[PDB]
Amino acid sequence: MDLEYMHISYPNILLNMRDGSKLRGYFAKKYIDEEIVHNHRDNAFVYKYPQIQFKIIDRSPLIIGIGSLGINFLESKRIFFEKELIISNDTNDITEVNVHKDMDHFGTTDKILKYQFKTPWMALNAKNSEIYKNSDEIDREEFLKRVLIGNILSMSKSLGYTIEEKLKVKINLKEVPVKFKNQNMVGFRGEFYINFDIPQYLGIGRNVSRGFGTVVKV
Amino acid sequence: MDLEYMHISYPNILLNMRDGSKLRGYFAKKYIDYKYPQIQFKIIDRSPLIIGIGSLGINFLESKRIFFEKETEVNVHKDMDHFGTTDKILKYQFKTPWMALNAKNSEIYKNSDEIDREEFLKRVLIGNILSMSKSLGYTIEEKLKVKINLKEVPVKFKNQNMVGFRGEFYINFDIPQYLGIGRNVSRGFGTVVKV
């Protein structure tokens, strides 16, 4: 598959992580109106992979739009020429902007690629949180290898790519605390290898919209 | 030993099995605010019922009953009844489903053939009774053994499917009425009633 993408970055503004929640927060109000950004419909939550995601990286804001659906909103409302951004409650003027856009490969590969997490992963849903906390660590390692396959399966579906070859994964990951919705869920930093191809800065796992689970090739 | 407890029940409102689902989050979440819940909200026969145990529980019940009113008739029952091992054997029934499977024990139970499942469940039941009795300050100094006739029943809880059990069981232990055992007891699961 070929996936069309566009990154938007504001290098002069720097924020702490995860003001990614707040970075997303601010676009959620100035753009309640079109709701790729907000991700809400009928006052009910939309259960698809976010084609607009807000991340905080190195250590300045990044906005990802994916596919024709994501990119076109990004252009249609002129976000890259955007006036002042505001975060709790302080105002940062947006003075210089770098936009990047291209389409590069997405899909299963017979060659094995190495990725790294910019942000915690948050691979554990509510039931999976619990299984993992009653397990020894050879087995923890085997559970996570299962979740990550699922995450690739989840994501590739909502983007209309069905996989007809076998995914295999190797992980070197170490556990890291993440506070989210005033609760102390668990997250992971680290490295992983896979016979799948991911374009840069895409997220996997839970809460990908707020910038969690951000991946880049090495 | 004597356990001090109190039921407060509201017979005139019958609930759908669906707004039955939402009332719990916010009430039990007022409840949440390494121990056995001394305030439990249960759904039985059904118009709401609320159990309080010990000084802590009775007081929550009376003081703050004014404050939880949701969406004319009241029956309170309240007393001290025995809690402890008995020299004769008693029969109980689950008024509400019993969730004996945590996430990892969820795992073992579906890995077993059905003779093995059944004595696996009696280990959980002994354990559940052991938990409850210590967290209420009673130490067990005799051998409990249990017989079970339980039926597996599908349970929807926290918007995802879990498995639970209905049925009847026997034990030489004494449980005051409407107490819950197992997981998620505060929210009404594992309610036992003597028969």
UniProtKB/TrEMBL annotation, chain A:
GO terms for molecular function: identical protein binding. Residues 1-100 form the Cas6b N-terminal domain. Residues 108-218 form the Cas6b C-terminal domain. Pfam families: Cas6b_C (PF17262), Cas6b_N (PF17955). InterPro entries: Cas6b_C, Cas6b_N. This is DNA repair protein. It comes from Methanococcus maripaludis (strain C5 / ATCC BAA-1333).
